[PDB]
Point group: C3
Chain length 156, copies 3
């Protein structure tokens, strides 16, 4: 039997960040040649990944932000991964972008890899928790993969 | 059997970086609702993770640093994962913050994922290897997960 | 019997970035104490990892760039993972360094972790897609690890 996993991403539909509003992740099919859903025993709900199987899971994400200091400066954001509800942020999952010294252009940020116990129905999402100016998100991607079955629970 | 793994983090207790001093990682329970230790056949020793089972592992870490160019400027830090001793740095595990490159404010960094053979008693730690100014670490997290039993 | 994996890296030989030129990754043994190739059912070809076994994989990379030397005023570099051909860039695999100051030392970037269905003969490489000024790459590492046998 296969590990549970999913990969949901945006590489085509820019979005403006909004405080505690999960980022839109409309695609699950990253292979440009053999284009198939990279999903097993998870569900992509358009703005995140829902867990169906209890277990220990690695979760992580990336964003691309277009920085131009327009219409206002500076343009800055802080993002986390959330469990179930947007304010329910997960430690270790911070990313941050600021236009103050980098200047202009697309900037890419990547979270670390968090290991966390998840249960059926758990919803993982990327949420902005602080914003200054208009944050133009040109790409985002959420990665969920099952490291192991529960290590203290028979079914959990 | 169950893959060996550990997640050791600090989200509660800011620390100043000191050269070749492992970062403090007091917590192992990241889920804010069902709070349980994310530890199987590893030990969280308080400033890193000790390997109890030989195998291939994926190792990675994160840091949050507060840059403000006070009391000295610029503020800069370079960090790497260490094996057993702080001088024994692991390739591909490097992170950096430089206030003259990225500007002041809170910055998050993340290492790549390192695939490495590890043996019982191996201690994985996050160490600063270069510090300019007083480097204020607001958060840190270390990730260790077995991907395979020893291939050879 | 064991998951397919490869770790190919450069900790030793600096290279200049060129547009759509895969980075050189000459080493497969990261453990400084017990130096063994971290390779199982993949091939390190010198500038990437070739897949031999169909499956779902996690792929990611890291680079270190030196802003020392490089007198050029603005320096910027954007990189992706490519599938088979350098122009065939994989979504979610972006990295970027953009500095308006030099002499600031080394800075590290890390991609996210992409989950992707790969087939035998597939070649994963790190490619520069945008370069402003001269980009001195002082280190690079590519991580390939199988997550699952094919699911459909
Ligand atoms: Au499983
Ligand atoms: Au987009
Ligand atoms: Au939906
Ligand atoms: Au559990
Ligand atoms: Au437990
Ligand atoms: Au195992
Ligand atoms: Au930077
Ligand atoms: Au902290
Ligand atoms: Au081995
Ligand atoms: Au190098
Ligand atoms: Au200048
Ligand atoms: Au500096
Ligand atoms: Au497939
Ligand atoms: Ca990363
Ligand atoms: Mg703008
Ligand atoms: Mg300060």
């Amino acid at each position: 039997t296969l590990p549970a996993f999913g990969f949901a991403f945006n590489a085509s539909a820019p979005q403006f960040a909004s405080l505690f509003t999960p980022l839109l992740l409309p695609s699950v099919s990253p292979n440009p040649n053999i284009t198939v859903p990279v999903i097993n025993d998870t569900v992509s709900v358009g703005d995140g990944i829902r867990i169906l199987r209890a277990g220990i899971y690695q979760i992580s994400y990336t964003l691309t932000i277009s920085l131009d200091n327009v219409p206002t400066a500076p343009e800055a954001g802080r993002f986390f991964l959330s469990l179930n509800t947007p304010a329910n942020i997960i430690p270790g999952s911070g990313t941050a972008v600021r236009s103050n010294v980098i200047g202009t252009g697309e900037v890419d940020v990547s979270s670390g890899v968090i290991l966390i116990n998840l249960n059926p129905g758990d919803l993982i999402q990327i949420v902005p928790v602080e914003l200054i100016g208009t944050v133009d998100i040109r790409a985002a991607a959420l990665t969920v993969a099952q490291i192991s079955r529960p290590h203290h629970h028979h079914h959990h």
